[PDB]
Amino acid sequence: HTVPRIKAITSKMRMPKSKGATVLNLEHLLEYAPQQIDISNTRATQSQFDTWYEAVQLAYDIGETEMPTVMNGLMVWCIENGTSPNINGVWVMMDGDEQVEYPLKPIVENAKPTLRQIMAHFSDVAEAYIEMRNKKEPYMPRYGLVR
Amino acid sequence: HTVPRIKAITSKMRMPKSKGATVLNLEHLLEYAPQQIDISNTRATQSQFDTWYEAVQLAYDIGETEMPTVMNGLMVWCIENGTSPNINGVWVMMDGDEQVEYPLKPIVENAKPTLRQIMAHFSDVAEAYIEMRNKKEPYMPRYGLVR
Amino acid sequence: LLEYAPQQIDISNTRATQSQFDTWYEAVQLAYDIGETEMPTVMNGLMVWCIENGTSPNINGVWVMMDGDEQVEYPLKPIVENAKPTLRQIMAHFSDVAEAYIEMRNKKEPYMPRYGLVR
Amino acid sequence: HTVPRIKAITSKMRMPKSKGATVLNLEHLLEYAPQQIDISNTRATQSQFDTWYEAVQLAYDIGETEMPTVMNGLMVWCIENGTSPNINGVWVMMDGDEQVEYPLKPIVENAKPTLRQIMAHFSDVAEAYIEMRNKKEPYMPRYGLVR
Amino acid sequence: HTVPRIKAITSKMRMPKSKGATVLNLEHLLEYAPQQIDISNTRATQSQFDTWYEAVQLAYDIGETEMPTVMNGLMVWCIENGTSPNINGVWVMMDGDEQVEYPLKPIVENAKPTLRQIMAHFSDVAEAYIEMRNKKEPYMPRYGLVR
């Protein structure tokens, strides 16, 4: 009478075993549902990102409220330009009609494992930023996304 | 009258012979029916898997009940990412909204003949895990299965 | 010449010579250091292991035979080595038994091997 | 019926023989499983290390509880700098914001066969120390490890 | 009718001749089938090995039953380390958690033509010893085999 429903884990599926016991905790494996970007190696670890963030803030010698504005310009600068730039150089943020100079050594250095992975944390914001700008001008960046 | 039934081994089939005697024990060959994954070289040997399992547990210096939870995260981390990662790196397991860091040297090393073969022991569980997650989100991993 | 009617597998170079096969057989038995009655059971597992896997495996490795729910380890160096001219030709002696073994197993499960036959 | 199991030592393997008798005690050879770092010549012998340890402690004329703190600084000083320094010099340990001077003659001398081999006893601790520091700053030493 | 069988030595093969007579005793040449390791110069002669064996035993001044245990440790010490070590040094054998010191001068000296050739007598046992240890740990020696 009852229409059967199949389980996710059957009693026929071979679990990995070591010394006669299973090596996976299935009571918690089904519950364990992380996000695909939190456990991907294409993104720098949060410990590495916070290591980079306060290392750049201390190198630039700026406060905690001035720091987010720098990241706004650094994200946009990383949209037009690449994530493998010259370490002995500068990156520019606009203050209206006046360019503002920042050394590129504190940024390329202290970014582990790679600036690409550190900059990949801005990918969701970067995509939204381009689409907003693309709605008012033929904006297309030379070097892909911030990733 | 009787409808004949053909034997599996006829008296006309050439057995391998050495010094006049057959080299195969046919009395036990028909009974011998192993599983295709237990005698395949695409999977690491159980002796090698147990060698890897206690070598990782001892390197991480954790108990026997905490160990299965690590393998739950390591399997999922091996779904999104590959089985040939940087040995000088870390792999991440989520504890809710906080990443947990584990060295990737005890994992890539001590896995013989290859991490792929060691990780291939999770293939049946890995396929079920994706299909369960794929039923609630467009989940697709960059690097295939755990194999 | 008219009387001379050999079998097509006894004079084919896709199969190792009987002198070479017996050279391989006692060379593997002596290397494994096992008796004459235990030896055929090893060949039963080695044939099946050569159905799922290939005949060009890593010489620095092992091949597995099942003892129920326990794997049994055998070095693959005495097998790949001492097999002349090639393990393929040495293993080709099991082709008739290998075909029958698969068809028997295929009658109870969707059994299909990655690496063809034992040949 | 029985699936054979191969012995580690077969009755066909040529043992080294002198005057008709074997030169290896096989009853104890299988049991004899030392650690690869206890019988390696890249590490100074324990007799040599203890010879160096009390020779440095006596030369510095310090107690037994003050001595371990000196080795903490000497290990770190041997991470940034090499293990072949000038014997007519000093090595520095920090006491906060004040450098502390120690002669380098009692260290380079009395270390047999080489300071490198004597300092190689700290390799496991040295690797852990760098990885701990590398998690909070881009720490990389000029002269490799303490080895 | 008879299918011919070819001889190993035909009546057309040029034998080496001196003064009209052959220089090889073919009646015994076919029977003469030595082992490839007994007549190879990569291995020290048995006369040289026994010369080395009792020369080391007499130098160490130990009995005939204590001697095989020393060779067990010396073989393993020659797996991790090389066969060209400093003659003015020591080699270590483990007694559990206590190193045991042996001079390396009686070993490097009295070994003719070379310690390598003298130590090559342990090659078969050395290969088996590593494979046994490699089944329980990622054991790999710096300096190849005992050869």
Residue numbers in the entry:
A (entry chain Ar), B (entry chain As), D (entry chain Aq), E (entry chain Aa): 42 to 188
C (entry chain Ad): 70 to 188
The article reads:
Potyviral CP plays a role in virtually every step of the viral infection cycle, from transmission of the virion by aphids, virus assembly and disassembly, regulation of genome amplification, protein translation, to cell-to-cell and long-distance movement. CP consists of a highly conserved globular core flanked by two large extended regions with a high frequency of structural disorder. The C-terminal high intrinsic disorder region (C-IDR) is partially conserved and packaged in the lumen of the virion, supported by the helical ssRNA scaffold. Here, we show that we can control the shape, size, RNA encapsidation ability, symmetry, stability and surface functionalization of nanoparticles through structure-based design of CP from potato virus Y (PVY).
To prevent encapsidation of ssRNA, we further truncated the C-terminus, excluding 60 C-terminal residues (CPΔC60) containing both the C-IDR and the α8-helix, which is placed opposite to the RNA-binding loop and forms part of the RNA-binding cleft. This indeed led to formation of RNA-free filaments. Interestingly, the filaments had monomorphic helical architecture, VLPΔC60:h, with unique helical parameters. Because we found that 19 C-terminal residues of this construct, including those of the α7-helix, were not defined by cryo-EM density, we prepared another deletion mutant, CPΔC79, excluding these residues. The disrupted RNA-binding cleft in CPΔC60/CPΔC79 thus lost the ability to bind RNA, and consequently the RNA-binding loop S125-G130 adopted the conformation found in the RNA-free filaments VLPh and in VLPr. On the other hand, the fold of the N-IDR in CPΔC60/CPΔC79 resembled that found in RNA-encapsidating filaments, consistent with the CP-CP distances along the VLPΔC79:h filament being closer to VLPh+RNA than to VLPh. Thus, disruption of the RNA-binding cleft by large truncation of the C-terminal part of CP prevents RNA binding and also leads to the formation of monomorphic VLPs.
